[PDB]
């Protein structure tokens, strides 16, 4: 049975106006800005952007990749697909 989301979990993350996007739950570094209550720090593959999102916008990668893991014209998306498949836990700083 499912646990709560934790750092390292892989997802497709949904933002207004964008397709479900390859992403991971990030850790929060010592001394870094914390997310609002009930939100997670989401690192978007390809774009390497971070936003704060709640569970309603987070789809587990294994379950969803057949639907959401197809090429997209949007900037960074196809790079993001490679990252989540091939080196999801790397440093992308």
UniProtKB/Swiss-Prot annotation:
Q: In which tissues is it expressed?
A: Widely expressed. High expression is found in heart, skeletal muscle, ovary and testis. Overexpression is frequently observed in hepatocellular carcinoma samples.
Subcellular localization(s) per the UniProt record = Nucleus; Cytoplasm
Residue ranges annotated for the PWWP domain, each copy included:
7-64
Task of the protein: Acts as an epigenetic regulator of myogenesis in cooperation with DPF3a (isoform 2 of DPF3/BAF45C). Associates with the BAF complex via its interaction with DPF3a and HDGFL2-DPF3a activate myogenic genes by increasing chromatin accessibility through recruitment of SMARCA4/BRG1/BAF190A (ATPase subunit of the BAF complex) to myogenic gene promoters. Promotes the repair of DNA double-strand breaks (DSBs) through the homologous recombination pathway by facilitating the recruitment of the DNA endonuclease RBBP8 to the DSBs.
Subunit (UniProt): Interacts with HDGF. Interacts with trimethylated 'Lys-36' of histone H3 (H3K36me3). Interacts with trimethylated 'Lys-79' of histone H3 (H3K79me3), but has higher affinity for H3K36me3. Interacts with IWS1. Interacts with H2AX, POGZ, RBBP8 and CBX1. Interacts with histones H3K9me3, H3K27me3 and H3K36me2. Interacts with DPF3a (isoform 2 of DPF3/BAF45C). Interacts with SMARCA4/BRG1/BAF190A, SMARCC1/BAF155 and SMARCD1/BAF60A in a DPF3a-dependent manner.
Protein family (similarity comment): Belongs to the HDGF family.
Q: Mind telling me what this protein is named?
A: Hepatoma-derived growth factor-related protein 2
Task: Give from-to of the shown chain within the full protein.
Answer: 1 to 93 of 671
């Amino acid at each position: 049975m499912p646990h709560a989301f934790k750092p390292g979990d892989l997802v497709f993350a949904k933002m207004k106006g964008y397709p479900h996007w390859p992403a991971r739950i990030d850790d929060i570094a010592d001394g870094a800005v914390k997310p609002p209550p009930n939100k997670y720090p989401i690192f978007f593959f390809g774009t390497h952007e971070t936003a704060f999102l709640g569970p309603k916008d987070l789809f587990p990668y294994d379950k969803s990749k057949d639907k959401y893991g197809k090429p997209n014209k949007r900037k960074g998306f196809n790079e993001g697909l490679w990252e989540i498949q091939n080196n999801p836990h790397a440093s992308y700083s």
